Amino acid sequence: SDPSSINGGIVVAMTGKDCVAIACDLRLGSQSLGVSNKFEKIFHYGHVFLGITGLATDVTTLNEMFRYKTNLYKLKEERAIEPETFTQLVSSSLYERRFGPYFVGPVVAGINSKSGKPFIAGFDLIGCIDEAKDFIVSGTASDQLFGMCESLYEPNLEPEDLFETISQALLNAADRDALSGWGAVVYIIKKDEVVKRYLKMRQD
């Protein structure tokens, strides 16, 4: 009965040269029992990407909540929300539930359309913002991901190289966690094209 580790799952985000990558596993389980091998944890509202680990009912609820909020934002502002602004919206929304929180570990990723700057950010369940140049990690194998990222990562990787680094970071971290894995997805995000790749990983 620990909400953050019932369903299991991981998200990782990295910055490269004029690009960002965000990746997640596909497992949804009920503790030991694997239930679904199609449960994606990365969503997008325009060009801003959000990965959410933790309790799966809150992952779904928050996705639906941010779609709702970014849709009204776009109608009133007459432009797509930017990563820096969306980060602040996520933080506000999570801290609104300070004494009854969503059991989630969200990760924002995207390129600012005006400045062209790669941007990533992570949050605790209470909405505290963790901004980073290099990488953000979240989920049941966050320890493993921290170890993989901190060793493998180097600055200013090209999109094709960054893909290899984030993929190996996620795969090897997931294989040391019981509640993570069962397939993986990697988003490579450039200024005005986005490639989505499904990784081949061990299915245990």
Binding site: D124, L125, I126, C128, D130
Partner: peptide, 4 residues
């Protein structure tokens, strides 16, 4: 929580 993240602490400081």
């Amino acid at each position: 929580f993240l602490w400081x």
